[PDB]
Design an enzyme around this catalytic site. Structure first.
Site, PDB file in Angstrom:
ATOM      1  N   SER A   4       3.409   0.913   3.576  1.00  0.00           N
ATOM      2  CA  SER A   4       4.670   0.139   3.488  1.00  0.00           C
ATOM      3  C   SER A   4       5.619   0.654   2.617  1.00  0.00           C
ATOM      4  CB  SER A   4       4.302  -1.234   3.343  1.00  0.00           C
ATOM      5  OG  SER A   4       4.343  -1.517   2.064  1.00  0.00           O
ATOM      6  N   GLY A   5       5.286   1.113   1.514  1.00  0.00           N
ATOM      7  CA  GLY A   5       6.200   1.571   0.329  1.00  0.00           C
ATOM      8  C   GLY A   5       6.394   3.049   0.531  1.00  0.00           C
TER       9      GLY A   5
ATOM     10  N   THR B 289       0.855  -1.110   0.052  1.00  0.00           N
ATOM     11  CA  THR B 289       0.015   0.118  -0.130  1.00  0.00           C
ATOM     12  C   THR B 289       0.697   1.195  -0.062  1.00  0.00           C
ATOM     13  OG1 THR B 289      -1.654  -1.322   1.502  1.00  0.00           O
ATOM     14  CG2 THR B 289      -2.040   1.040   1.134  1.00  0.00           C
ATOM     15  N   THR B 290       0.104   2.237  -0.603  1.00  0.00           N
ATOM     16  CA  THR B 290       1.091   3.794  -0.814  1.00  0.00           C
ATOM     17  C   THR B 290      -0.019   4.806  -0.789  1.00  0.00           C
ATOM     18  OG1 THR B 290       2.915   2.429  -1.518  1.00  0.00           O
ATOM     19  CG2 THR B 290       3.118   4.814  -1.461  1.00  0.00           C
TER      20      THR B 290
ATOM     21  N   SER C  77       4.593  -4.985  -2.303  1.00  0.00           N
ATOM     22  CA  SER C  77       3.414  -4.923  -1.890  1.00  0.00           C
ATOM     23  C   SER C  77       2.600  -3.967  -2.343  1.00  0.00           C
ATOM     24  CB  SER C  77       3.389  -5.103  -0.337  1.00  0.00           C
ATOM     25  OG  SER C  77       3.730  -6.155   0.204  1.00  0.00           O
TER      26      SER C  77
END
Lengths: 237, 212, 233, 211, 241, 201, 123, 202
Positions: free
Chosen positions: H130-131, H1-2, H169
């Site tokens: 996370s990114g 996710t970002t 991800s």
């Protein structure tokens, strides 16, 4: 004939008869007086006849090192409210580590006593109180009724035939704010000496006294210790 | 499990007043995520507070204290709260909440100035409470308290400027030998007039030792 | 009725309590007096037939070795506060390792008088008050003491009290026959002669119960033969 | 963890017409020192006194409970509380939290109702007993033997049984605390003493080793 | 009416909850507590009668600080009104705790009116006997004045006259311009109003209470200073005759 | 700890030691392990002192209330049953208890043994503690219903001393009691440092 | 739930519900009891002939335990309930105490029950 | 996710990716991570999907019910505080990591962050997922005061793309939304529309 049995029905004239009936009870006991000066506050009670139907009563109680009370009606409700106040003060001292003021305590008393005056099958506390204390803001004297409406007073009396004491008090007012302890006590005694039926003058076995101020933790005076205070009194005219 | 945390807090008392200092960082683990948040507040005109540890519980306590003071400032009776009462309330709250195994991961430092008398408290997650003329949380207890102690043991009467400079010095040392710090710290004061807060500040620094 | 229970009259007085106090005067007579060396308590028993051995009629009980009691009125509602008294005394001895005074006992017992209401009132509670008059008695840190109770929570210390139906004759004849330095013998003789005066029967040697408490001995309830030597006069 | 070790020792002594309660004035945690001014002795009445050591947060909220219960007893019974009643109350107060207990070692000292001396020792669960001397705390193991020897005359031969006095006990406790500071780390930085006798209470403070 | 007035859960033949008329009949026996709103704030002019002068100056206070920005002026029983003040304080604190900004006034009025009206249906309670007024001022919105009766009605006004002299006092506010003049030059009008309306033979004496909110107090509700109360009283005493 | 008890012609005999440790450190050496519940009954301490004291003070309270309500003194079996039933509610929580209830009733003498697990059994000879095995061996050689009071006293003293000479967590003084038909009495509080001389030691 | 204070006082104490209950007891199959040096007897009178009846079902006398018995002279359902609860108590006592009950014990139990139901709400 | 959110003068801009994952397998490659809350207020979900969906639905309900009474468009601080309380009362059972953005007539465009703890901070721009760790340095060296709309749009697009290459991800389609006074405008980027950076080769 039908609005005088519950604390909920309003009368066509905007009155609740049951609370009047309750207030009629506080005006049945013996008289009590409370007053204050620049730095001291005083309460006096007049235990009646000391042997028959009033053999030995107690009309003064200790609430805390800076708060005391005097009662003028029923006794069980009095002990109830007294325990209430003691627990509230102990909670304040346990939480904040500081004595609770007087105005806030009176507010809590009114908030508690107002509830039963609204809902069903309940009745208001039939006791009138005279409270004395000393906080950072100086001395304080308060009056409380069955109806949860509290007053602040410079000097007040409650009980049987206390109207004469009201007149006397209003007479000699400006003399206050300058007199010391003994003077205030003599004033209060000369005041409540009027309720009597022109007979049965004061003695050392009927009067109870409580005194508080900046250097006193609400001291009490029993029957034997009033004698030094009883002197200085002239005969009833 | 605390996620976003705060680092050490400083407090020292001079003559007629007290001073406090705290950085600006909501570190998440080993990451410098938030860098312009304040960890000092102002309860009233004669009391100020500082927190370490988790930042959300700090906000909760901030909200509750603010509402308490507002409820007090409505009636109007000439009374008010003093640093002692705030200190006691905090200690009791922490103890009661810890006795249920749901503590508040925070470490509180309280200043104040009553009528002629100052105050400087300490509160922990477990209810440990005491007073002193100086203290510090976190690594500040190993790198800062010694200096303050050594300075008071020879002069237990300090002026405003002396306290300010000593605070700046200990903050510099913390920035040198600590890994979760930053060069943006606020420094608050409380005199007989009231409470005041200085904006974001920065310290002087030397690195000549790197040439050897 | 159509008037509720927790109501006031146009005189400041409750109704149900004013009505229950009108019952005490339908019970048996009880007497209690104090001296500088002991307290005496006495009670009458109104049997109804030569049967019904009066050994079972018990109106003077033991709250503790240094505290007793006597009741009048409704004997049924009386055996609800005695267990509370014993409970409190033992709980005190357990928590503090000492003896409970008389004032504390009477206060704790009277705190339970005006707990009643037709509404919730914490269900399992009382719907009306107790009709009973209680007279305590015992020795404590400060000499012999004595108290009194009424069904409104208005106890009061006294030195010579008499309750029951004819509570006036036993008071107008008790104001003049008392002095602060009387002994136990004359005390008991006066109590017994005034009981004789107010009794309805011929004052048999078993129509009455008696007890005394003084510092040396504990609560001692007299036997049938001891009640003979005294009645000879 | 819900507990902490703050250190601290306590000592108490009795006599014919007096009682003594001595303690340190230091508060530590781990390998560091929090403060050098935190006494343990506490006054409850004009004739009884208490001493507590262990976990601070537990030794700070029990005192308030005892004070409140004393006020309530005084309000209900119309008289103050003696020493034995205090101990009998503290036993129950401690046993209430049995499966989640405190971590404080208490010692009570004062005058008996007759006029004599009394000291009561406790344990964190609520088992107490009356004694003549005790040294509960972090340094009990160092002090108890010396007190045994110099107040019971054990392992001594042809030694009289002279009584004790006030000045003697004061000097003895002072020398003892002076001795126990050079071998224990949680002890030092101050010394406090509270004496209770037939004319009230006295307090004294003494300097000690820093380390 | 035989028994149609013994309960709040009974409609009379014509359709009427008599127990509420009987309650509001209580406020027709109290002192007058008018208040107005011109351009930048609200102004109350409560009057508290003098009885048993042994009391202090400041007892039986009838002006509460419900919150940092709103003010209340009551009329009727004081105990019920104090209870309602506590209710409003709790409402305004919870609103802030849940959302995060000072509660407005319309919502406060509506909530408290719901609470008041909850008691006009069942028989296990008694309708209140107080009729009060709320006042506030803000920068986003402007000046807001309201009023509540024991039945639960909330309407917005420019001027109200709760009290026994509900009539003969509203008229004295019509001639005034209750939308143009600023919040500083109306204290005099309010004071002379409550002074000329007062009867001097049926009542012995009284004392005058006031309040203030607006741009001058920066939205905060505070008492009116005494240095201006002096000139206000002078203006009234000079205007009466 | 070390406690023993045995009944015979002239009543019941009880005995214990006067030591209390916390690990390897001797905290106390003047403890009183024979709890005086009342002028009619007796107790015994073993395991946890706080429990063995609290749960028997409560038992004293209840026995007194019983005597007040029913005008008849309580028995021993009822006492043990009350204690067991009041303690069974805390099974598996951390209580430690071992006790002996000793007395005299219309059924003659009485000796019962109770613990926290729930078992309740009568008997004629009991010993409890970390040194009861060393006492059983010497009490079993010398026991007899037809004993004389002096010999029984000597036997109890000897058993306690021999148990103390081996068990490390047992020692101090030997306090001997004796219960008769009209109450009980205390006999002696001898010291072990002096018996070692009187006996063959 | 229900709570209305059924039993209340009167201008002379005179709890009227109790007077009415004992006025009912003024009927209900008179009983009799006696105590001798060797035997205890107790009887009761049957109000009807009722040939078609099964006697063992309509018995007034009963047993609370091997040692105790009782009769009654009022309503039958309330009596049944009282007897059942008394049996329960007499059996629970023998469990705690290792001996049977006495008569005073169970009598006091039974009477405290009636008092409590005389003072409580909705009952 | 970002997820990324930026603020300009008269409004705001949002940006998110289009991937969902349950290990090393992709359950969806188009999911929408931009959830409207009101007519002019949005949100950006992260962490668990169930908890985020539930929280967002409940907040939408409460805010609609609170706005229908006052008869006034709501504010962003209100919704942010509602989120704060809902995620702080259950911080031991939730993993949300949410962002809020929108417009209101009193103050202009507003942005707020609300991580797993239950905090609330407002900032000139925000990021999450996370990114994000892989771009904490790109937003710092490129942000500047005085940015217009298109600038913020392409800035968000570039940052998302740079985070969707190194992280496993995250990836797929790039969803964007621009908010202002007049109204909302959505947009989707894919294929040759996404930026590209030449790979290094020796």
């Amino acid at each position: 004939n039908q609005y005088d049995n519950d604390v909920t029905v309003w009368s066509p004239q905007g009155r609740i008869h049951q609370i009047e009936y309750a207030m009629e009870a506080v005006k049945q006991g013996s008289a009590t007086v409370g007053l204050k000066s620049k730095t001291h506050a005083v309460l006096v009670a007049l235990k009646r006849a000391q042997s028959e139907l009033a053999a030995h009563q107690k009309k003064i109680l200790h609430v805390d090192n800076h708060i005391g009370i005097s009662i003028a009606g029923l006794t069980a409700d009095a002990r109830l409210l007294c325990n209430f106040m003691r627990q509230e003060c102990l909670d304040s001292r346990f939480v904040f580590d500081r004595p609770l003021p007087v105005s806030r305590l009176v507010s809590l008393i009114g908030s508690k006593t107002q509830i039963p005056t609204q809902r069903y099958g309940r009745r208001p506390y039939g006791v009138g109180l005279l409270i004395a204390g000393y906080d950072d803001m100086g001395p304080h004297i308060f009056q409380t009724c069955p109806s949860a409406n509290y007053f602040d007073c410079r000097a007040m009396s409650i009980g049987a035939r206390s109207q004469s004491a009201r007149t006397y008090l209003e007479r000699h007012m400006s003399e206050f704010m300058e007199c010391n302890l003994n003077e205030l006590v003599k004033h209060g005694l000369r005041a409540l000496r009027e309720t009597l039926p022109a007979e049965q003058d004061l003695t050392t076995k009927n009067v109870s006294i409580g005194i508080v101020g900046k250097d006193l933790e609400f001291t009490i005076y029993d029957d034997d210790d009033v004698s030094p205070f009883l002197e200085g009194l002239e005969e009833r005219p | 499990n605390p996620m976003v945390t705060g680092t050490s807090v400083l407090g020292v008392k001079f003559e007629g007043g007290v001073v406090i200092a705290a950085d600006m960082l909501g570190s998440y683990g080993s990451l410098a995520r938030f860098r312009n948040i304040s960890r000092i507040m102002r309860v009233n005109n004669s009391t100020m507070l500082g927190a370490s540890g988790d930042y959300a519980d700090f906000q909760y306590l901030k909200q509750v204290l603010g509402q308490m003071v507002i409820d007090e400032e409505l009636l109007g009776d000439g009374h008010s709260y003093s640093p002692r009462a705030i200190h006691s309330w905090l200690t009791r709250a922490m103890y009661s909440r810890r006795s249920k195994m749901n503590p508040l991961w925070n470490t509180m430092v309280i200043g104040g100035y009553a009528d002629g008398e100052s105050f400087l408290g300490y509160v922990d997650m477990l209810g440990v409470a005491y007073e002193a003329p100086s203290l510090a949380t976190g690594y500040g207890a190993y790198l800062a308290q010694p200096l303050l102690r050594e300075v008071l043991e020879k002069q237990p009467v300090l002026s405003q400027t002396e306290a300010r400079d000593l605070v700046e010095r200990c903050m510099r040392v913390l920035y040198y030998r600590d890994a979760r710090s930053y060069n943006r710290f606020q420094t608050a004061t409380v005199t007989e007039k009231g409470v005041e807060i200085e904006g974001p500040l920065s310290t002087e620094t030397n690195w000549d030792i790197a040439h050897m | 009725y159509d008037r509720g229970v927790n109501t006031f009259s146009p005189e400041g007085r409750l109704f149900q309590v004013e009505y229950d106090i009108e019952a005490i005067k339908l019970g048996s007579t009880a007497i209690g007096i104090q001296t500088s060396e002991g307290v005496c308590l006495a009670v009458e028993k109104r049997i109804t037939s030569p049967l019904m051995e009066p050994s079972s009629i018990e109106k003077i009980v033991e709250i503790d070795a240094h505290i007793g009691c006597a009741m009048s009125g409704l004997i049924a509602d009386a055996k609800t506060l005695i267990d509370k008294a014993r409970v409190e005394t033992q709980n005190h001895w357990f928590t503090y390792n000492e003896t409970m005074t008389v004032e504390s006992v009477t206060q704790a017992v009277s705190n339970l008088a005006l707990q009643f209401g037709e509404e919730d009132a914490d269900p399992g509670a009382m719907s009306r008050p107790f009709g009973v008059a209680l007279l305590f008695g015992g020795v404590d840190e400060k000499g012999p003491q004595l108290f009194h109770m009424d069904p409104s929570g208005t106890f009061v210390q006294c030195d010579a009290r008499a309750i029951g139906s004819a509570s006036e004759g036993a008071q107008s004849s008790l104001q003049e026959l008392y002095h602060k330095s009387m002994t136990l013998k004359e005390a008991i003789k006066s109590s017994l002669i005034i009981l004789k005066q107010v009794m309805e029967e011929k004052l048999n040697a078993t129509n009455i119960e008696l007890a005394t408490v003084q510092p040396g001995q504990n609560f001692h309830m007299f036997t049938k033969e001891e009640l003979e030597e005294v009645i000879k006069d | 963890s819900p507990y902490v070790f703050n250190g601290g020792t306590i000592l108490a002594i009795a006599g014919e017409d007096f009682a003594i309660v001595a303690s340190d004035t230091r508060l530590s945690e781990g390998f560091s020192i929090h403060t050098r001014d935190s006494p343990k002795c506490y006054k409850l009445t004009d004739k009884t006194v208490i001493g507590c050591s262990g976990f601070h947060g537990d030794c700070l909220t029990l005192t308030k409970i005892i004070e409140a219960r004393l006020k309530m007893y005084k309000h209900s019974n119309n008289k103050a509380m003696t020493t034995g009643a205090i101990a009998a109350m503290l036993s129950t107060i401690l046993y209430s939290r049995r499966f989640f207990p405190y971590y404080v070692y208490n010692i009570i000292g004062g005058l008996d109702e007759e006029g004599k001396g009394a000291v009561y020792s406790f344990d964190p669960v609520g088992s107490y007993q009356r004694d003549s001397f005790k040294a509960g705390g972090s340094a009990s193991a160092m002090l108890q033997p010396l007190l045994d020897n110099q107040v019971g005359f054990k392992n001594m031969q042809n030694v009289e049984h002279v009584p004790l006095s006030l000045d003697r006990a004061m000097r003895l406790v002072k020398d003892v605390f002076i001795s126990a500071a050079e071998r224990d780390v949680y002890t030092g930085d101050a010394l406090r003493i509270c004496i209770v006798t037939k004319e009230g209470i006295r307090e004294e403070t003494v300097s000690l080793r820093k380390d | 009416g035989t028994g149609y007035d013994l309960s709040a859960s009974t409609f009379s033949p014509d359709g009427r909850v008599f127990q509420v008329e009987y309650a509001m009949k209580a406020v027709e026996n109290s002192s007058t507590a008018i208040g107005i709103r011109c351009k930048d704030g609200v102004v109350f002019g409560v009057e508290k009668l003098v009885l048993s002068k042994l009391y202090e100056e400041g007892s039986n206070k009838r002006l509460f600080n419900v919150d940092r920005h709103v003010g209340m002026a009551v009329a009727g029983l004081l105990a019920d009104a104090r209870s309602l003040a506590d209710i409003a304080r709790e409402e305004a604190s919870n609103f802030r705790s849940n959302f995060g900004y000072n509660i407005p006034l319309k919502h406060l009025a509506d909530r408290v009116a719901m609470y008041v009206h909850a008691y006009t249906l069942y028989s296990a309670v008694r309708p209140f006997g107080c009729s009060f007024m709320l006042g506030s001022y803000s920068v986003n919105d402007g000046a807001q004045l309201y009023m509540i009766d024991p039945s639960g009605v909330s309407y917005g006004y420019w001027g109200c006259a709760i009290g026994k002299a509900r009539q003969a006092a509203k008229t004295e506010i019509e001639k005034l311009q209750m939308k143009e003049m600023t919040c500083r030059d109306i204290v005099k009008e309010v004071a002379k109003i409550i002074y000329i309306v007062h009867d001097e033979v049926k009542d012995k004496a009284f004392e005058l209470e006031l309040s203030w909110v607006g741009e001058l107090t920066n939205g905060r509700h505070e008492i009116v200073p005494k240095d201006i109360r002096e000139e206000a009283e002078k203006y009234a005493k000079e205007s009466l005759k | 700890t070390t406690t023993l008890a045995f009944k015979f012609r002239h009543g019941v005999i009880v005995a214990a030691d006067s030591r209390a440790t916390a690990g390897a450190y001797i905290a106390s050496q003047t403890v009183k392990k024979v709890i005086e519940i009342n002028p009619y009954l007796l107790g015994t301490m073993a395991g946890g002192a706080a429990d063995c004291s609290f749960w028997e003070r409560l038992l004293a309270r209840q026995c007194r209330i019983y005597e007040l309500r029913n005008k008849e003194r309580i028995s021993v079996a009822a006492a043990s049953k009350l204690l067991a039933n009041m303690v069974y509610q805390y099974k598996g929580m951390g209580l430690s208890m071992g006790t002996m209830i000793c007395g005299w009733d219309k059924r003659g003498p009485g000796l019962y043994y109770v613990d926290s697990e729930g078992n309740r059994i009568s008997g004629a000879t009991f010993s409890v503690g970390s040194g009861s095995v060393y006492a059983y061996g010497v009490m079993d050689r010398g026991y007899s219903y037809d004993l004389e009071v002096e010999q029984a006293y000597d036997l109890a003293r000897r058993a306690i001393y021999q148990a103390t000479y081996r068990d490390a967590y047992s020692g101090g003084a030997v306090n001997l009691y004796h219960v008769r038909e009209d109450g009980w009495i205390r006999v002696s509080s001898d010291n072990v440092a002096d018996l070692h001389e009187k006996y063959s030691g | 739930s229900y709570d209305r204070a059924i039993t209340v006082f009167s201008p002379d104490g005179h709890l009227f519900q109790v007077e009415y209950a004992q006025e009912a007891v003024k009927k209900g199959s008179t009983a009799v009891g006696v105590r001798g040096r060797d035997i205890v007897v107790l009887g009761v009178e049957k109000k009807s002939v009722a040939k078609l009846q099964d006697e063992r079902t309509v018995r007034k006398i009963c047993a609370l335990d091997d040692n105790v018995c009782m009769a009654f002279a009022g309503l039958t359902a309330d009596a049944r309930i009282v007897i059942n609860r008394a049996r329960v108590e007499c059996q629970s006592h023998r469990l705690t105490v290792e001996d049977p009950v006495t008569v005073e014990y169970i009598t006091r139990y039974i009477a405290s029950l009636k008092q409590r139901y005389t003072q409580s709400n909705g009952r | 996710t970002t997820i990324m959110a930026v603020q300009f003068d008269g409004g705001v801009v949002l940006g998110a990716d289009s991937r969902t994952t349950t290990g090393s397998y992709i359950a969806n490659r188009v999911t929408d991570k931009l959830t409207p809350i009101h007519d002019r207020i949005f949100c950006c979900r992260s962490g668990s999907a169930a908890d985020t969906q539930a929280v967002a639905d409940a907040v939408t309900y409460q805010l609609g019910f609170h706005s229908i009474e006052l008869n006034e468009p709501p504010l962003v601080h209100t919704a942010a505080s509602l989120f704060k309380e809902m995620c702080y009362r259950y911080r031991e059972d939730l993993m949300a990591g949410i962002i809020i953005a929108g417009w209101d007539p009193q103050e202009g465009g507003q942005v707020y962050s609300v991580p797993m703890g239950g905090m609330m901070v407002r900032q000139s721009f925000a990021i999450g997922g996370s990114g994000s760790s892989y771009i904490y340095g790109y937003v710092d060296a490129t942000y500047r005061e005085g940015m217009t709309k298109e600038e913020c749009l392409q800035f968000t697009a570039n940052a998302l793309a740079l985070a969707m290459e190194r992280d496993g991800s995250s990836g797929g389609v790039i969803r964007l939304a621009a908010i202002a006074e007049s109204g909302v405008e959505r947009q989707v980027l894919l294929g040759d529309q996404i930026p590209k950076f030449a790979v290094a080769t020796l």
